[PDB]
Design a protein around this ligand. Structure first.
Ligand code: ULU
Ligand code: ULU
Ligand code: ULU
Ligand code: ULU
Lengths: 264, 264, 264, 264
């Protein structure tokens, strides 16, 4: 099948990539980075997020695999010593696919109310450029709170172990089709009030962030920034699209959580 | 239809109950507290939890309604001045029902490994009698962590605004069939380690709490305690049973959250 | 005595300032904004922080008073209706002064290791421009942790009810000569580790923040930014200087806390 | 000098104690557990807290030393392999003493308003027997908040790395004469409100806990419980007494914190 391999870029990852390419050359496997059906990421979770966005337009036709040349990653869940066994089992095929939910981010900007859309595998954040900013939080067209603070983070299930976790959010199993909103240093006194707790939204719920005064701020989607100015709204909802993983053995999410945060 | 009315017990609630009973006497409505199809709770959320457990054996044949004689409740979402309109709309019928997920708690105890089961509308907690206690946390038969601290709380979705919220847990919309585990003052140092973050589990996942040394502690289910000694395991899973609410108008969960924590 | 009055700038504050100036004209009080002995701030805590930095070079010769034209402030603890009584009691004199500790911030920058120093009444923060940044935390010349996250906040006692509070820090009575360091969304996994808890340092302890890779970031002191590039170190210590308040009646810190966060 | 040695009780600690006793027999050192001037604790922090309370009536005449037969402790900061060097340097003398602040707990109980007093090295806690309880919090005779939740914890500086830390409290250097109050799962909604943040009190401030309805609950002082019923008040204040440590080398508090929570 058509495949491609992304590399973190250091000597170790580039070398494993070349050895896997040589291994794939011994089967009916063609290297194609334009229309790959299999995308292998060799590096960390940052390398994997890069591969995801590199092919975010062909998500339904791609199964991702991550190899971690350093420590264990949440998306890179293969050890480099198993690369040959990966090439072998990947060559034959007949593997099962596993799908994780994604986050759709819509940004309304400009005088013409143009709308740009993005997909996030970890999270999308809206953050003040400097100091605190003010944003109205609207849930299914009802005004919920006026947030004053550093920013807000909307995470996917698999993203809950990332930025979301550092903000006090809950860890959610990726079989739950949902999104989680966490606060970044909210102001709470007699006059200003936020819910404080993380909020977990099901499918079809729409969370709208509407900045009040200043209209220029930082919007992130995973490891990058959404470059649009004069923003009037950031809408969040569980995407109808999913990322597909090629799985070859049982590595449960909670064991992955245990291995990455408890002890390995 | 057969109905019954529980009362908080003060003058205000007893009086509204008697007036509603008189109102129901003007329709084809029979008072029956043995096999009611409608259970009306007049009081707070504590009164509502009492009504739930009072009829936890006929949950699939009952639609609950809560009236709050004091402040707004999360389960008591009717104002006393609307009691007549409630009797009227309840008398005719044709209302829609809304179902919230529940939590199944199984307690393995004794030499014979007997198993008692309970249903929780808010949460079930395992807490040390005095000082900290030690419990092994097993998720789908894999050991996840050894918890050392004051206790653990497993909450339903509608329970996430209760004990769960005070422990730092996330607020989950009740359409999500899940349960959330939060820690109570865990010890974390070089030797002892817990995940710290709240954990959200989907259906069919089983969380097993297995106390290590001391085998006598406090188990709660909502507002009461499970009285069984020589405990060997407390198993948590999303129940296959649901609580059914009779709804007569739109009162969304997030507006209920806003009204109870932000401002009303 | 020589005095001056700063104004928030809206109609209400400018008007009270002009009326107080007219009131002071009836006593041996001279308006002098170059060498004032009394500085009156009419507005919010933001107006008061402006007045503090406007005269941060003559702190030992000035007693500050704050009037809040809106809600109660932590530094503006006079109501506008008491402005006449303030002018009267201020005119006579014989009032007691109250001193709060301050925070000294030293920034080492450039090839020549130049050092600029600043005083903070609330806090000084070091924050990443975009995404997370890495800083080594050195306490009294011993390496304590390598912080990876959004930033760090070092607060004075009176500042603990401000940014520090939103970051989970403790509220400290201003009679305690100390500073408190809080984290902003630290990364914590198997590889990366911070203390997590807020840290409270006594006098003469020096906390040094030494950025690891990127050397360009945002340094704040109260409501403004310290504009120096090529930073090599940010040193924190309790200042030997103090801010002096003119007090005319008992308004204890904890009652001020109660009035601003509990209920007023 | 007169000395005594407490032991955790396992084979390793009892054996080191007997070897140190034999070592002390070679100097002008007399074993006396009635009036010791030096108290050596061999075990963990639990063993050290036992030794502290065992001699809490002669604190001003005793210098404590802790040896940790297992992992490093915050009070047991000597390794067992250095026991001979400890006996040797302790035999000569001329060591410096280091003093940490303590917490005075006064319990008013009974019809006669009797008052029992206790000293805490780590903390004193007031906790509900079952479910949540209600206590009024009075600071210097002014009512600050009505706490509804699981309990409250008042910690010494050296205690801030213990129960206080697990409750979100700040870590305070023991040179700061203060006490810190942290909440245990407080209820916060539209009707019920607490400060939420930890509170740090200087010397001479008195925090009074006055239970509202139920008058029977659990009071702890370090590892034990204060057995008095019909309680009307629990008063907290920084004690005028201090615990004295015999120090033989520099082991700074922050390095001790780093070694116990970051990495060792
Ligand atoms: N504050 C905070 N906190 C927390 N978190 C966070 C923050 N911010 C941000 N964040 C994240 O991040 C991501 C991105 N990136 C890249 C870039 C950045 N970075 C760098 O720099 C490095 C160094 N550091 N420093 N300084 C990529 C990634 C990733 C991931 N993912 C995940 C999941 N899912 N789970 C779990 N884990 C995880 N991870 C991790 O994380 C870290 C960082 O990464 C590392 O380990 C990795 O493995 C965004 O997305 C957000 O989330
Ligand atoms: N710590 C903590 N925190 C938090 N929380 C908690 C705690 N513990 C417990 N808890 C809860 O609680 C419940 C039970 N109870 C009764 C009994 C007890 N109580 C009493 O006493 C009173 C007084 N107080 N004091 N002191 C009933 C109920 C309920 C409910 N539910 C809900 C939901 N769902 N959401 C929201 N909210 C809510 N609620 C609320 O809550 C509170 C208390 O209630 C009140 O307001 C009410 O409305 C158990 O279940 C747990 O959850
Ligand atoms: N995230 C976060 N959180 C928290 N916090 C914070 C933050 N960031 C920052 N911060 C603060 O701030 C300050 C400054 N500023 C001005 C500027 C900014 N601002 C604006 O925009 C407005 C709107 N908002 N929004 N969006 C001034 C001031 C002040 C103060 N001070 C105090 C004390 N001491 N205590 C208590 N409270 C207080 N305060 C308050 O606070 C708020 C804000 O202000 C208000 O209410 C006032 O009264 C810096 O310093 C930091 O601290
Ligand atoms: N929740 C929570 N959390 C936290 N914490 C706490 C709690 N509760 C309580 N606590 C503590 O504690 C103590 C007492 N104890 C004994 C008894 C109990 N115990 C047992 O069991 C064992 C097993 N476990 N489990 N389960 C003794 C001691 C101590 C101490 N001290 C200190 C300082 N200062 N710093 C730092 N660290 C420390 N420590 C530690 O801690 C842990 C526990 O110990 C161990 O590692 C030790 O080394 C009371 O006092 C309170 O604090």
């Amino acid at each position: 099948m058509k495949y491609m391999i992304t590399s973190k870029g250091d000597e170790k990852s580039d070398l494993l990539r070349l050895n896997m390419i040589a291994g794939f050359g011994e089967y009916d496997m063609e290297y194609d980075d334009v229309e790959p059906e299999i995308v292998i990421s060799i590096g960390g979770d940052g390398t994997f997020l890069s591969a995801f966005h590199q092919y975010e337009e062909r998500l339904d036709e791609i199964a991702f695999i991550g190899i971690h040349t350093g420590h264990l990653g949440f998306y890179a869940d293969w050890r480099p010593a198993e690369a040959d066994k990966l090439v072998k089992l990947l060559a034959k095929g007949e593997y099962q696919k596993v799908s994780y939910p994604l986050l759709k981010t819509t940004v309304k900007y400009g005088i013409g109310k143009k709308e740009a859309t993005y997909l996030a595998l970890n999270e999308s954040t809206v953050k003040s450029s400097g100091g605190p900013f003010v944003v109205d939080v609207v849930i299914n067209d009802i005004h919920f709170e006026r947030f004053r603070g550093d920013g807000l983070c909307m995470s996917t299930p698999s993203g809950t172990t990332a930025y979301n976790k550092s903000l006090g959010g809950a860890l959610m199993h990726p079989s739950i089709e949902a999104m989680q909103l966490t606060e970044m240093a909210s102001i709470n006194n007699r006059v200003y009030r936020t819910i404080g707790s993380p909020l977990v939204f099901p499918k079809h719920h729409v969370v709208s962030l509407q900045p009040v005064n200043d209209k220029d701020f930082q919007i992130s989607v995973d490891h990058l920034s959404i470059l649009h100015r004069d923003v009037q709204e950031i809408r969040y909802e569980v995407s109808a699209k999913k990322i597909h993983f090629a799985r070859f053995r049982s590595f449960p999410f909670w064991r992955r959580v245990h291995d990455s945060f408890i002890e390995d």
